[PDB]
């Protein structure tokens, strides 16, 4: 477009982010589709044990203050989930970090109860990886899916 | 007399004032020395944060980001790593010249 | 058209081993499992190329207008 | 640009009185009697010196006089006009570090002049800028001078006297 | 400081579709109404059946700002106990009176205590460790 | 803290088989991002000579213009680098190609009707029917003769067919060598394949003596497992001999008695070569390109 009454409309009215829900029945139309959905049930799986150097690298590979993604103007890290033998991080704690660092600090953390499409018995003896439970901006239980 | 002031390009809008959180954008790079340096920076115990990134693989871009704990700016921890990326090649050559010549 | 010069995956030189390959088949009556193997091809990316090659250059060379008949 | 245009008018014009050059320093240095009270307090607030590109614009021009006008303001009694060998000591050793945000060439010449006549001794702080250190608008206007020695040889016939030479 | 301290007795080590994480189940020897339902990285810390744990939940080591990996010469409460995690209690629940059964999420590794006197000293603090000696 | 002089005490090299076309050597206790970076140079950043520019004068044959222009460029010309310098192609042809950057080649092949008596073979029926790539002649341009008295330009693989010709057809062209690296075009690759693999480690868990030891050979390549009797029930001779097959993890009797997995710090680099340079020296063109890819960062002004 060719003037400034239109460039504001393409940034405020008919942009993509305001078109998140359909105006048909309010269902979403954005979203990751094939690669990452089946990829995400591996990082959120319980066997994801990142080491120290990977943990910033998976964080810095998706979060760049240089290009300006963050809000805190410095990438902040979490304590690992294993301390004494060998310090390892966790993939649910990566989703804890990428909710910490692209959400504003004035608001507090998130809280969410949600289900999956994985039934509980696929992980062993009735474990609770169907109930995706966010508390205080953390992925404390549950694997991330299309749902 | 010519400085090539376009290689080690330090972005400033993601840079701490004290220099303990610096921001680069290295051209004529990709995953080649991106991960070869990121290994060697993270061996320095003063370094608190070091990842290397690529915004888009098409052109030559390598945004890396050193952050430290204290008493050393991130550029002063860069140049220890590039000192210890060279001294590795001192070790590899004189342990691979010493084996070609040893048969 | 003629034998390709390098393998399409690895990077080893292939074209000098095509007419040197039919001289392990028309003469020694070898099987391809030794005929490809005796040359030096030992990665299957560069071993489905001398085996498989159509070599339709011969059906082109019969159509020459720079010769009487 | 006008604070850069004013800086090279004063030190390239011959027919101005010596009491008229102090009239500049009756207000330009008095402009530094106003920044010393008012805005020496935003540096401890978390902010760099990129907001003060207006402030180092005029501060170049006052040192652009000092790099040229040196043998004018003597007296018989060994003093200077409003302590010229004490004003550039105070506004450099402050908490603003002007040695980095002034150009090297204009500080190469601020140093040799302040060594012979004993004005400033910031030499060990000039040395302390390797471990101390968008950007293009702050290097060119610390080097663009509106009254350069002219390439034209013919117009200087009309301007042989009214334009100052090197020395 | 220490919130909880006991010695448990492993019965079930469930492999259950994982290569590294085994949902341990145990109960104590001292008390009888208290158990454990803990995920541990069995690659780092092998746990078989019929063993003796020491599940000690502490509150810190012996406020510090930054977690940094260890230097040469400090002294920690994690020095003597062989496997240490970090986690929060995300749900409190009571089955009956003096059968209060807490929960935890040790980084994505769920734990379930149960008991009667741990209502005194197990808050749902966002900094609550886990430890095992022997 | 991790000293780099502890790295020297944990870095060994086992050169196994060193030939003038391939070298199979080991790197003990180095990282998958340092040893990748060596492998990251040896494909791409090593300089190697080939031809971008094919000046046709005459070609009427069946293999057309850009195709035979392509297949000259894929020929590894046995030209040692560091005896040419780099082109500076920001300026036109008048000084772009010198006598010092470019090696100049020519092809002149004419096919005629050869009368011969008998289904008839094409080498006896025609004179110069098959354009072999040993027909590339080095034209010594400029001063390229006082120092090429022991390194004349020969192609490294001479028997490459380039074209097949019939009578009447000829090929007259002029070729220009350019000094290049394998990021731009594939044809400047200095290697067949400079890949590594990583040392597997096979751990028996339960002792598999007897009949479980004899059937245990056929799951693996042969020179790996050594079984004798009850005593000397099994061991591993050399897992370097063992490629990763995982045949034994098809068997249900053995799917819980063994552990397969790499030793994460023993890189078996087996670098072959296309023919331009020896593998045991293009690896030295990666231990000294890395060392001179850091100096271009280190001794360089950190801008702004
Ligand atoms: Zn191949």
Which residues have their alpha-adjacent CB atom under 5 A from ion ligand 1? C 7, 10, 43, 45-46
Q: Which of A54, A57, A66 to mutate to test the interface with B (most CBs of B within 10 A)?
A: A66
Cβ proximity of B41 and B50 under 8 Å? yes
Closest residue by Cα to residue F271 from C12, E21, C34, B66: C12
Cβ proximity of B24 and B81 under 8 Å? no
Cβ proximity of D111 and D123 under 8 Å? yes
Closest residue by Cα to residue A82 from B69, E81, E17: E81
CATH number of the CATH domain containing C35: 1.10.10.60
Give whole-number Cα distances, F38 to A117, E118, F22, in Å: 45, 57, 16
Cβ proximity of F181 and F45 under 8 Å? yes
Whether F283 and B96 lie within 8 Å, measured CB to CB: yes
Contact exists between D and B (3 or more beta carbon pairs < 8 Å): yes
> Dihedral sign, CA of D13, D16, D22, D27?
negative
* Beta-strand relationship, F130-132 and A49-50: unpaired
Cβ burial of D55 (10 Å; 0-12, 13-18, 19+) is middle
Give me the residues paired with residue F78 across strands.
F154
Q: What span, in angstroms and rounded, lies between the C-alpha atoms of B64 and B35?
A: 10
Residue E45, C-beta contacts closer than 8 angstroms, at least 6 positions apart: A85, E82, E83, E132
Q: What span, in angstroms and rounded, lies between the C-alpha atoms of A14 and F190?
A: 53
E70 vs B contacts (CB less than 8 Å) = none
Cβ proximity of E79 and E133 under 8 Å? no
Q: Under CATH, domain F48-186 is a member of which superfamily?
A: DNA-directed RNA polymerase, insert domain (2.170.120.12)
C39 belongs to an annotated ligand binding site:
no
Closest residue by Cα to residue E88 from E75, E106, E64, E74: E106
- What DSSP designation does F298 have? H
Q: What is the dotted CATH code of the domain comprising F1-47+187-304?
A: 3.30.1360.10
Cβ burial of D95 (10 Å; 0-12, 13-18, 19+) is exposed
Per-position DSSP letters for chain E, written without gaps between them? -EEE---EEEEEEE-TT-SSEEEEEEEESS-SS-EEEEEEETTTS---SS-B--EEEESS-----------SS---TTSSSSEEEEEB-----BSSTT-B---EESSS-EE---BSSTTSS----S-EEEEE--
What is the rounded end-to-end Cα distance, in angstroms, of chain C? 23
Helix, strand or coil for residue F170?
strand
Q: What span, in angstroms and rounded, lies between the C-alpha atoms of D83 and F223?
A: 93
Q: What span, in angstroms and rounded, lies between the C-alpha atoms of A13 and B4?
A: 45
Residue F157, number of CB atoms within 10 A of its CB = 22
Whether B8 and F300 lie within 8 Å, measured CB to CB: yes
Helix, strand or coil for residue D92?
coil
What is the rounded end-to-end Cα distance, in angstroms, of chain D? 25
The coordinates were experimentally obtained by cryo-EM
Q: How far is B47 from chain E (nearest CA, A)?
A: 10
The token duo for E31 is 């008390």
Chain B (38-77) residues lying within 8 Å, Cβ to Cβ, of chain E: 45, 48, 69
Whether A82 and E83 lie within 8 Å, measured CB to CB: yes
E108 vs A contacts (CB less than 8 Å) = 44, 46, 81, 90-93, 139-141
- Domain parsing of chain B, residue ranges: 1-103
Q: What span, in angstroms and rounded, lies between the C-alpha atoms of D163 and F118?
A: 102
Buried b (16+ CB within 10 A) or exposed e, A75-85: bebbebbbbbe
Q: What span, in angstroms and rounded, lies between the C-alpha atoms of D154 and D158?
A: 8
Of B12, B40, B96, the CB nearest to F13: B96
- What DSSP designation does F303 have? B
Cβ proximity of A29 and E1 under 8 Å? no
Q: What span, in angstroms and rounded, lies between the C-alpha atoms of D7 and D63?
A: 9
Of B17, B73, B76, the CB nearest to D48: B17
- What DSSP designation does F43 have? I
Whether A85 and E83 lie within 8 Å, measured CB to CB: yes
Task: Round the CA-based radius of gyration of chain A to a whole number and report it.
Answer: 18
Q: How far is D24 from chain B (nearest CA, A)?
A: 36
Closest residue by Cα to residue F109 from F66, F149, F68, F73: F68
Cβ proximity of B52 and B11 under 8 Å? no
Cβ burial of A28 (10 Å; 0-12, 13-18, 19+) is exposed
The token duo for D81 is 């006009």
For chain C, the chains sharing at least 3 beta-carbon pairs closer than 8 angstroms are F
Per-position DSSP letters for D56-68, written without gaps between them? HHHHHHHHHHHTT
The token duo for E134 is 């022997």
Angle between helices D55-66 and D2-10 (to 10 degrees): 10
Q: How far is B18 from chain D (nearest CA, A)?
A: 9
Give whole-number Cα distances, D90 to A6, D127, E67, in Å: 54, 18, 44
Cβ proximity of B88 and F7 under 8 Å? yes
Domain of residue A82, residue span: 20-147
Give whole-number Cα distances, C20 to C15, C16, E38, in Å: 9, 7, 67
For chain E, the chains sharing at least 3 beta-carbon pairs closer than 8 angstroms are A, B
Residue F163, C-beta contacts closer than 8 angstroms, at least 6 positions apart: C2, F61, F62, F63, F68, F109, F130, F131, F171
Please report which residue ranges of F192-269 form alpha helices under DSSP H: 211-214
CB distance from B73 to chain D under 8 Å?
Answer: yes
E1-134 adopts what CATH topology? OB fold (Dihydrolipoamide Acetyltransferase, E2P) (2.40.50)
CA of C33 from ligand 1 middle (Å) equals 16
Task: Round the CA-based radius of gyration of chain C to a whole number and report it.
Answer: 14
How many structural domains is chain C composed of?
Answer: 1
Cβ proximity of A44 and A143 under 8 Å? yes
Cβ burial of E105 (10 Å; 0-12, 13-18, 19+) is buried
Residue F145, C-beta contacts closer than 8 angstroms, at least 6 positions apart: none
Rounded to the nearest angstrom, the gap between the alpha carbon of residue D159 and the centroid of all alpha carbons in its chain is 25
CATH number of the CATH domain containing A66: 1.10.274.100
Domain of residue C52, residue span: 1-69
**What residue has token string 């502490």?**
E58
C22 belongs to an annotated ligand binding site:
no
The token duo for D92 is 């450099």
Domain made up of B1-103: CATH architecture: 2-Layer Sandwich (3.30)
Closest residue by Cα to residue E11 from E47, E54, E56, E55: E47
């Amino acid at each position: 477009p060719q003037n400034e009454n239109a460039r504001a409309e393409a940034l405020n009215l008919a942009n993509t982010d305001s078109q998140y829900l359909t105006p048909t029945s309010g269902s979403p139309v954005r979203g990751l589709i094939q690669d990452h959905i089946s990829a995400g049930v591996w990082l959120t799986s319980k066997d994801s044990f990142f080491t120290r150097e990977q943990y910033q690298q998976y964080i810095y590979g998706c979060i760049r203050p240089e290009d300006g993604h963050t809000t805190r103007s410095k990438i902040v890290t979490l304590p690992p989930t294993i301390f004494k033998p060998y310090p390892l991080w966790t993939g649910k704690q990566i989703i804890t970090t990428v909710l910490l660092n692209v959400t504003p600090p004035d608001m507090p953390g998130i809280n969410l109860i949600s289900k999956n499409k994985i039934k509980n018995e696929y992980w062993g003896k009735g474990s609770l990886e169907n109930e995706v439970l966010f508390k205080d901006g953390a992925l404390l239980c549950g694997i991330l899916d299309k749902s | 007399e010519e400085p090539d002031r376009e290689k080690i390009k330090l972005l400033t809008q993601a840079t701490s004032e004290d220099g303990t959180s610096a921001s680069f954008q290295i051209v004529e790079e990709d995953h080649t020395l991106g991960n070869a340096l990121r290994y060697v920076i993270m061996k320095n115990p003063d370094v608190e944060f070091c990842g290397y990134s690529i915004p888009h693989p098409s052109e030559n871009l390598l945004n890396i980001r050193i952050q430290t704990y204290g008493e050393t700016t991130a550029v002063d921890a860069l140049q220890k790593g590039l000192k210890d990326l060279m001294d590795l090649c001192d070790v590899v050559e004189s342990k691979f010249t010493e084996k070609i010549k040893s048969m | 058209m003629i034998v390709p010069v390098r393998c399409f995956s690895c990077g080893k030189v292939v074209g000098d081993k095509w007419e040197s390959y039919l001289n392990l088949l028309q003469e020694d009556e070898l099987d391809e499992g030794t005929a490809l193997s005796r040359l030096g091809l030992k990665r299957y990316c560069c071993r489905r190329m001398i085996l498989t090659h159509v070599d339709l250059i011969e059906k082109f060379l019969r159509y020459n207008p720079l010769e009487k008949r | 640009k006008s604070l850069q245009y004013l800086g090279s008018y004063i030190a390239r014009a011959k027919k101005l009185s010596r009491t008229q050059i102090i009239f500049v320093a009756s207000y330009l240095t008095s402009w530094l009697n106003r920044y010393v009270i008012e805005r020496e307090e935003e540096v401890d607030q978390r902010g760099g010196m990129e907001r003060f590109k207006h402030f180092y614009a005029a501060f170049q021009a006052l040192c652009y006089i000092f790099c040229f006008r040196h043998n004018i303001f003597r007296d018989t009694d060994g003093n200077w006009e409003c302590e010229l060998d004490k004003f550039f000591q105070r506004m450099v050793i402050s908490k603003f570090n002007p040695l980095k945000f002034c150009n090297e060439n204009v500080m190469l010449m601020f140093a040799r002049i302040a060594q012979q006549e004993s004005v400033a001794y910031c030499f060990s702080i000039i040395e302390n800028n390797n471990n101390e250190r968008t950007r293009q608008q702050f290097i060119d206007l610390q080097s663009y001078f509106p009254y350069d020695p002219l390439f034209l040889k013919n117009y200087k016939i009309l301007m042989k006297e009214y334009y100052i030479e090197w020395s | 400081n220490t919130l909880f301290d006991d010695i448990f007795q492993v019965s079930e080590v469930d492999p259950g579709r994982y290569n590294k994480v085994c949902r341990i189940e145990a109960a104590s020897t001292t008390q009888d109404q208290c158990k454990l339902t803990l995920d541990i990285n069995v690659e780092l810390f092998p746990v078989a059946a019929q063993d003796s744990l020491t599940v000690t939940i502490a509150s810190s080591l012996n406020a510090t700002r930054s977690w940094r990996p260890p230097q040469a010469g400090d002294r920690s409460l994690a020095d003597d106990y062989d496997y240490v995690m970090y986690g929060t209690a995300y749900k409190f629940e009571e089955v009956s009176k003096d059968l209060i059964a807490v929960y935890y999420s040790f980084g994505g590794l769920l734990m379930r205590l149960e008991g009667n006197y741990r209502n005194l000293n197990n808050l749902k603090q966002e900094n609550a460790y886990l430890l095992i000696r022997r | 803290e991790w000293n780099v002089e502890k790295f020297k005490k944990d870095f060994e090299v086992n050169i196994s088989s060193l030939d003038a076309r391939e070298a199979n050597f080991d790197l003990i206790n180095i990282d998958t991002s340092i040893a990748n970076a060596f492998r990251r140079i040896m494909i791409s950043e090593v300089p190697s000579v080939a031809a971008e520019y094919v000046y046709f004068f005459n070609n009427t044959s069946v293999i057309q213009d850009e195709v035979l222009a392509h297949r000259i460029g894929l020929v590894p010309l046995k030209v040692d680098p560091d005896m040419l310098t780099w082109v500076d192609s920001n300026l036109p042809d008048d000084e772009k190609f010198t006598d010092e950057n470019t090696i100049v080649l020519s092809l002149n092949v004419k096919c005629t009707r050869n009368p011969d008596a008998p289904s008839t073979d094409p080498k006896e029926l025609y004179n110069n029917a098959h354009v072999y790539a040993r027909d590339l002649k080095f034209e010594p341009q400029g001063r390229q003769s006082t120092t090429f008295a022991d390194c004349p330009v020969v192609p490294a693989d001479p028997d490459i067919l380039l074209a097949k010709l019939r009578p009447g057809q000829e090929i007259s062209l002029k070729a220009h060598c350019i000094l290049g690296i394998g990021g731009d075009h594939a044809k400047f690759s200095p290697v067949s394949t400079a890949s590594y693999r990583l040392l597997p480690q096979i751990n028996i868990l339960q002792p598999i003596k007897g009949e479980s030891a004899r059937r245990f050979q056929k799951c693996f390549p042969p020179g790996v497992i050594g079984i004798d009797e009850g005593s000397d029930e099994a061991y591993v001779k050399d897992a370097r001999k063992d490629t990763v097959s995982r045949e034994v993890l098809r068997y249900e009797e053995f799917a819980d008695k063994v552990k397969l997995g790499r030793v994460r710090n023993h890189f078996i680099f087996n670098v072959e070569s296309a023919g331009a340079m020896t593998p045991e020296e293009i690896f030295f063109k990666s231990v000294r390109i890395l060392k001179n890819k850091a100096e271009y960062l280190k001794n360089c002004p950190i801008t702004q």
